Amino acid sequence: MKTRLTNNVDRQSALYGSSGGTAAQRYEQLRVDRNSPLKRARDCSKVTIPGLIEDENYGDAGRLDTPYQSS
Amino acid sequence: MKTRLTNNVDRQSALYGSSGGTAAQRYEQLRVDRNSPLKRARDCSKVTIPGLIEDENYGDAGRLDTPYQSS
Amino acid sequence: KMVKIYTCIKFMDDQCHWYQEIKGKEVPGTHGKCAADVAPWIALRQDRVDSEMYGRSYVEQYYGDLLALEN
Numbered sequence A, B: 001m002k003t004r005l006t007n008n009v010d011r012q013s014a015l016y017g018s019s020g021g022t023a024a025q026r027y028e029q030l031r032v033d034r035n036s037p038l039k040r041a042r043d044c045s046k047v048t049i050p051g052l053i054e055d056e057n058y059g060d061a062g063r064l065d066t067p068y069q070s071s
Numbered sequence C: 001k002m003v004k005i006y007t008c009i010k011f012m013d014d015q016c017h018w019y020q021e022i023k024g025k026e027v028p029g030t031h032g033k034c035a036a037d038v039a040p041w042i043a044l045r046q047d048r049v050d051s052e053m054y055g056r057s058y059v060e061q062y063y064g065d066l067l068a069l070e071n
Helices: A023-048 B023-048 C063-070
Strands: C006-012 C015-022 C031-035
Touching: A023 C006, A023 C063
Parallel strands: none
Antiparallel strands: C006 C015, C015 C031
């Protein structure tokens, strides 16, 4: 149906096409550099709050552990 | 686009030319003198706040260390 | 079953631009345009550490002490 995730306050006509690659290719290119900070954030979250930032395979049927300090 | 990193309040015509070398050469000449205080500042930062002043190869994908005191 | 949907953002001539695409072709009516000073997208980072595409979380400062106390 109506895919409306963006407001219609500044909507306009078509101004750019596919002049060079697709957004999927750029996303796949940039995830390589994005990798490490995600790992750091995931480790920090695991040590502070077990289930805030999650692994891609710990969703509907994932189990979270608990730390031995609540500071 | 428009490179405006300087204000447009005292802008004038071209009054200074290339009379002797380029600013890159002067910068390369003076970096030798600038070296040591950078090292002192870097070590002080490392002992006080690990990631404030960084080396040129500890940016996008570098990891910092944490001290054993918070004074 | 789900279907992936992407979004692209380009910043130039202080005029941000965006559009939505699915399976390699843009979705009609999803275009937009506005000045950079009134952009709808805002990027943040905790500690301003220069020459880094991603910042450092605050808890990274005391991650080591947290781990030691836990153990």
